[PDB]
Write a protein that binds this ligand. Structure first.
Ligand SMILES: [K+]
Ligand SMILES: [K+]
Ligand SMILES: [K+]
Ligand SMILES: [K+]
Ligand SMILES: [K+]
Ligand SMILES: [K+]
Ligand SMILES: [K+]
Ligand SMILES: [K+]
Ligand SMILES: [K+]
Ligand SMILES: [Mg+2]
Ligand SMILES: [Mg+2]
Ligand SMILES: [Mg+2]
Ligand SMILES: [Mg+2]
Ligand SMILES: [Mg+2]
Ligand SMILES: [Mg+2]
Ligand SMILES: [Mg+2]
Ligand SMILES: [Mg+2]
Ligand SMILES: [Mg+2]
Ligand SMILES: [Mg+2]
Ligand SMILES: [Mg+2]
Ligand SMILES: [Zn+2]
Lengths: 59, 174, 147, 206, 38
RNA sequence: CACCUCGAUGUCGGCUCGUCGCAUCCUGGGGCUGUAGUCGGUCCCAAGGGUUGGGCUGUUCGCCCAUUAAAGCGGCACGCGAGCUGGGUUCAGAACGUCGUGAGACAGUUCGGUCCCUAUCCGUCGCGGGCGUUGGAAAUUUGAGAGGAGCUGUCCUUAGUA
RNA sequence: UAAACGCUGAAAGCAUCUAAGUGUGAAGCCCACCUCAAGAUGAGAUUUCCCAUUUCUUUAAGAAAGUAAGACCCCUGAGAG
């Protein structure tokens, strides 16, 4: 799951570590299993999560 | 006290052509080209050329001096050229030039034959003296060194080919 | 629930990328290329299935060797006969057979198994700026930010 | 310069001044250039050459078709010669023994006579063990190596099939050439049994 | 050429330099003083 | 020292076969010389090849004889005994000197004294079968890679010149 | 290329074989000479030969059954074993 999430995060312009830190800041608790599932299946949903993580990181 | 800072003049009608690199010099003797460093800046006056380095780092000081020396050598060679004078000493040691070919008899069972490149010439004012004359200091020195190494001087009796005037220590072999 | 996605052979589309090695350090070029060949850049990555993309390396003759590696990095190989050790410097390999240089570097970074060797076959190295795989419609892959 | 022939046998000849020298008689029925290989079509320069006309019943349609270009009968032996001037050769051209002149220095290639399974003593010229003094070690190939490797290093030479190998003898001399009989007399001896294929080429060393 | 770990000048003419990462002592006066570090 | 091996890891020398290290014996290159020349001395680079036939002794070693360009030093279970030998170590016999009252023993010698195994696996040297190499066939081929080879004397001439 | 020797050349007005630049240099290293070699699964290349058949299933890189080019079985043998 970590590997797949990393690939998806890179495609969204972010590293896995940055994405997880951003999600923690944004209060997102979705775990790595669900994150990898979204990355493979629901690219749009994963992109929304990545946008929120980047926003939290910027703040 | 710095070769890199010292200015270089353009005597007579020596001309210089510029380019991103690969500076060229022309004059009475001929043409030359060297790919100087991209960091040393060359400033050109009507007849004077100077070199500048970006900073005072070890590398910049070193390369500044080297480029200035190289450019100065090119100019002096284009104007007057360079000559290496060799004086062979021996009972039957002799040299003779047929055009660009130098034939040396220095005691070997066979004569030694040397060929100058188009940029160099051999004078041979006498059978015991040779002068390598050219435009490029590097090539002149290299050819002169090769001629000397054919049969370098020896200490016991002074025999061999010598650079004219070079000190050659001599041993009192019993 | 056992719902993790698992890729299948042949369902996933493998693209074709062109990588320019001009003045890129050998190791860094090999690392990015190895990740691409394994498919680590795609969310569908499945360790037990090949899912990476083909890679074409151009200008292999211009790969970069920092330090004295051009003269000091030595590649050894043993014929398995007594005293049958042979060596060749990395610089000599770059000059004469650059394809072998890149391929050896990438082999070292791929897994040493059936899947790894099959993934390696998807590599294609060419000294020079032209390749014969125009039919595959490869796309440039900028790596300046990946190294 | 090169040609293919058959090792007829061995004899001797008296040269001028009466010296006696051993010669090998090699017959070479005019060989035929069957194909010319170029950098464009094959990536290297060489000429394919056929020798020893073959009965039709012994040939195949593919073989007959291949020689059809040269417009000759089927050939038993076919070999490629390199390091020659392609301009001077063309499909259908013949090569005769007169290519070589007496006194030419040549390399002769053949297939060594087959000795079959042979022991190490004969095959590799190894030393025997003592034949007396209680010795029970006569014609064996020696030790197999040190203990430490727990194995035998490669090239530990042992018994096996001997001969039948491609061997070249360098810098032989063309004693004589008989064009009418298509014969070349080469000083010395050359590998291969009688009636075997032989390849004469201009010595590379020269 | 004296190849030794310790290379030092022996007369005032001896000069210490580095070539190809090796320490060397070169003396135009006495060639016996010629030393390399090794 | 006593960590593996005492429900056994055969122990010297020699023979057969070698392979490797370079701290190089010869050959190759070079610096310095208290290097005139011929010889050399010392040091540096160099492991490609080569580096013996005998007398004595079980011997290694060593001495000697005669050669060689040289007669290198070492590792590999002081390489190699399911490859050989068995001269020595060392069994049982017997004897000498010596020790012991003695049986016996060595702080020592001498003569004589059983060396087993049909190779399953890997490994090594050769030779086939199967399939693959993407229609089925007959030939000729490039060379990724690999192996082999790699030694050296004397004489003549240059010149009795330097 | 090794040791070694340089040429030009500054750092360091000099000096300096090195930092840039450039060369000579060993029975050694890569070739050169000989042999093996595309199971080099990366299985390469060229020349030549055969020709798109029949039946049934299924759109099947389907199945089997006559063959073509060719090979082999079998038989006479050696230059091979
Ligand atoms: K034990
Ligand atoms: K040894
Ligand atoms: K010396
Ligand atoms: K050696
Ligand atoms: K003896
Ligand atoms: K035994
Ligand atoms: K054993
Ligand atoms: K086993
Ligand atoms: K093939
Ligand atoms: Mg013998
Ligand atoms: Mg092992
Ligand atoms: Mg001292
Ligand atoms: Mg204890
Ligand atoms: Mg046991
Ligand atoms: Mg050494
Ligand atoms: Mg006797
Ligand atoms: Mg032993
Ligand atoms: Mg054993
Ligand atoms: Mg008593
Ligand atoms: Mg008896
Ligand atoms: Zn001094």
């Amino acid at each position: 799951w970590i590997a797949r999430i990393n690939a998806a995060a890179r495609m969204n312009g972010l590293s896995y570590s940055k994405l997880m830190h951003g999600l923690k800041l944004a209060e997102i608790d979705i775990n790595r299993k669900m994150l990898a599932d979204l990355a493979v299946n629901d690219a749009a949903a994963f992109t929304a999560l990545a946008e929120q993580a980047k926003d939290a990181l910027s703040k | 006290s710095r070769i890199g800072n010292k200015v270089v003049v353009l005597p007579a009608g020596v001309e210089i052509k510029q380019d991103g690199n690969n500076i060229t010099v022309k004059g009475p003797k001929g043409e030359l080209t060297r790919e100087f460093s991209s960091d040393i800046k060359m400033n050109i006056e009507g007849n004077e050329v100077t070199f500048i380095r970006p900073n005072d780092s070890k590398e910049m000081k070193t390369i500044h001096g080297t480029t200035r020396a190289n450019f100065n050598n090119m100019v002096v060679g284009v104007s007057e050229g360079f000559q290496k004078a060799l004086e062979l000493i021996g009972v039957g040691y002799r040299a003779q030039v047929q055009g660009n070919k130098l034939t040396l008899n220095v005691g070997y069972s066979h004569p030694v034959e040397m060929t100058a490149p188009e940029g160099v010439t051999f004078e041979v004012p006498a059978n015991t003296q040779v002068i390598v004359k050219g435009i490029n200091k590097e090539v002149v020195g290299e050819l002169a060194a090769n001629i000397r190494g054919v049969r370098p001087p020896e200490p016991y009796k002074g025999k061999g080919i010598r650079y004219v005037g070079e000190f050659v220590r001599r041993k009192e072999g019993k | 629930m056992r719902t993790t996605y698992m890729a299948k052979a042949g369902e996933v589309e493998r693209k074709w990328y062109v990588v320019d090695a001009t003045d890129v350090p050998l190791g860094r070029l090999s690392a990015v290329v190895a990740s691409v060949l394994r498919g680590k850049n795609k969310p569908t990555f499945t360790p037990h299935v090949d899912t990476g993309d083909f890679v074409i390396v151009i200008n292999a003759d211009k790969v970069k060797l920092t330090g004295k590696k051009a003269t000091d990095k030595i590649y050894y190989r043993h014929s398995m006969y007594p005293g049958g050790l042979k060596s060749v410097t990395a610089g000599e390999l770059r000059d004469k057979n650059s394809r072998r240089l890149i391929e050896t570097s990438v082999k070292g970074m791929l897994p040493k198994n059936t899947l790894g060797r099959k993934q390696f076959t998807k590599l294609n190295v060419y000294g020079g700026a032209e390749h014969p795989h125009a039919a595959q419609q490869p796309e440039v892959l900028d790596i300046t930010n990946l190294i | 310069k090169g040609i293919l022939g058959k090792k007829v046998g061995m004899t001797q000849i008296f040269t001028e001044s009466g010296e006696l020298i051993p010669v090998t008689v090699v017959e070479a029925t005019p060989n035929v250039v069957l194909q010319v290989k170029t950098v464009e079509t094959d990536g290297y320069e060489a000429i394919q050459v056929g020798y020893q006309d073959k009965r039709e019943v012994l040939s195949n349609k593919p073989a007959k078709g291949h020689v059809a270009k040269a417009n000759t009968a089927p050939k038993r032996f076919i070999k490629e010669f390199k390091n020659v001037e392609l301009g001077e050769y063309e499909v259908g051209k013949e090569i005769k023994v007169d290519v070589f002149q007496a006194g030419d220095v040549v390399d002769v290639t053949g297939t060594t006579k087959g000795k079959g399974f042979q022991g190490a003593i004969k095959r590799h010229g190894q030393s025997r063990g003592p034949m007396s003094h209680g010795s029970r070690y006569h014609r064996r190939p020696g030790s197999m190596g040190p203990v430490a490797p727990n194995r035998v290093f490669k090239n530990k030479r042992l018994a096996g099939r001997m001969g039948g190998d491609r061997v070249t003898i360098q810098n032989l001399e063309v004693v004589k050439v008989d064009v009418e009989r298509n014969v070349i007399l080469i000083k010395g001896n050359i590998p291969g049994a009688k009636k075997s294929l032989i390849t004469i080429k201009s010595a590379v060393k020269a | 050429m004296k190849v030794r770990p310790s290379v030092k000048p022996m007369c005032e003419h001896c000069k210490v330099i580095r070539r190809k990462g090796r320490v060397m002592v070169i003396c135009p006066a006495n060639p016996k003083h010629k030393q390399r570090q090794g």
